[PDB]
């Protein structure tokens, strides 16, 4: 019921945290709704969209192939690795690794892909190359989730992340094929049910990537719109709240519900 900004303020109040969000028109890139859009928030697993953008850029360049098989060992595993642990014996293709990182937040998958793009430093260099002068990755899984108060490491801003998503998905930075593939991994997100998807009307397009971190860090980056067409980018981050995962889920969903209810305007 309440207007998006009012819902956001209510969420921030109830969480005793900080919320950062932006709603951006996809085609024009114009900002539609913003709150703390220039403040820094931990990316958590939301970085994996940027990561796989870098992977696809190498594919476009012929320096990588999605069908390339990567083999790895026990020493490569970090906590939370449902897919990569299952495939320890067989290895995984680059494309399977991106699907695991994006759709399942598989941490070891992200670390394997991170190594192919020159690590956090290499991924950050890619960010700078595409004109994102704010977003930065500094660490590997799982330390990048630490979310220390005031620490700029492994952070983005809602505004920067929205612009960068727009660049990856609609500009000449990626080939058309790579654009469609990156979008597809986000469409196929398996673990984003409790957030915007929980309040998304039937018949709407959605492609997303979520993240969870320490100190209450929680986030979603999404493309959505009515009539099965991506219309707007919505980025919502939470930080520095003692609230439970479920409350954090509920609050993000509520912000999503307000944006959807008040879409026209």
């Amino acid at each position: 019921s309440p207007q998006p900004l009012e819902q956001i303020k209510l969420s921030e109040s109830q969480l005793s945290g900080r919320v950062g969000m932006i709603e951006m028109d996809l085609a024009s890139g114009r900002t539609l709704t913003a709150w703390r859009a220039d403040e820094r928030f931990p990316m958590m697993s939301t970085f994996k969209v940027v990561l796989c953008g870098a992977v696809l850029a190498r594919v476009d360049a012929g320096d990588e192939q999605l069908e390339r098989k990567i083999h790895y060992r026990q020493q490569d595993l970090v906590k939370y690795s449902p897919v990569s642990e299952k495939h320890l014996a067989d290895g995984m293709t680059v494309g399977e690794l991106c699907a695991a990182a994006i759709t399942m937040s598989d941490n070891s998958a992200a670390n394997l892909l991170l190594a192919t793009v020159g690590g956090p430093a290499g991924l950050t260099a890619f960010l700078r190359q595409i004109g994102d002068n704010v977003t930065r990755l500094d660490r590997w899984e799982t330390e990048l989730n630490e979310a220390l108060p005031g620490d700029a490491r492994d952070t983005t801003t809602p505004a920067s992340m929205a612009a960068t998503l727009r660049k990856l998905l609609t500009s000449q930075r990626l080939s058309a094929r790579s654009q469609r593939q990156l979008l597809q991994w986000m469409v196929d997100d398996r673990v984003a049910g409790p957030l915007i998807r929980s309040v998304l009307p039937a018949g709407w397009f959605i492609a997303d990537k979520t993240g969870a971190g320490e100190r209450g860090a929680r986030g979603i980056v999404a493309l959505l719109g009515p009539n099965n067409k991506a219309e707007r980018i919505v980025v919502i981050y939470l930080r520095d709240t003692p609230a439970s995962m479920a409350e954090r889920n509920q609050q993000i969903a509520g912000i999503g519900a307000a944006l959807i209810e008040h879409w026209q305007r």
Binding site: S81, K86, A192, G193, P194, T210, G211, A212, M245
Partner: protein
């Protein structure tokens, strides 16, 4: 039915069929194919990212195939987590599982993954433990954890995160 749980994970045994596993886990929690090939992946509470789960591997794709592989994250708690960095540093490759637990604390670990390449024989058995400081499995300051992996009950390597 109900959600997948540590209780159900413990109920399920090496040697069980796919039908026995689904029967115990609750088929509404589980999936096969896709990312998991012919394994069965059973989901805990739908928290979003990093949801608790088990994955069960079988000797083959045959209906009568037997569980030779059990993996889980976030379904089982350590009984008395007391891992520290100093304890972790006292662990050396070559140590037996027994010697490891005496070193890191008898209740510090849970079983992440356990696989029998010659099931029912234990020859070549691989075992990964996750071990935890007091808040490692929780919330709380002492958030350190480690991964220790064995072949034939003998330590082949270790890695840690956040230990002090």
């Amino acid at each position: 039915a109900g959600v997948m749980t540590g209780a159900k994970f413990t109920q399920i045994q090496f040697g069980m069929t796919r039908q026995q596993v689904l029967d115990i886990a609750g088929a509404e929690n589980c999936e096969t194919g896709g990312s998991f090939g012919d394994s069965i992946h059973c989901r805990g509470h739908a928290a979003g990212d990093y949801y608790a789960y088990a994955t069960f591997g079988f000797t083959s794709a045959a209906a009568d195939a037997k569980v030779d592989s059990k993996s889980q994250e976030k379904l089982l708690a350590p009984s008395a987590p007391t891992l520290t960095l100093a304890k972790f540093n006292q662990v050396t490759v070559g140590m037996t599982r027994a010697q490891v637990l005496a070193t890191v604390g008898q209740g510090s670990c849970t079983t992440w993954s356990e696989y029998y390449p010659a099931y029912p024989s234990t020859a070549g058995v691989t075992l990964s433990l996750s071990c935890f400081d007091v808040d490692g499995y929780s919330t709380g300051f002492y958030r350190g954890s480690a991964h220790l992996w064995f072949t034939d009950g003998v330590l082949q390597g270790k890695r840690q995160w956040d230990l002090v």
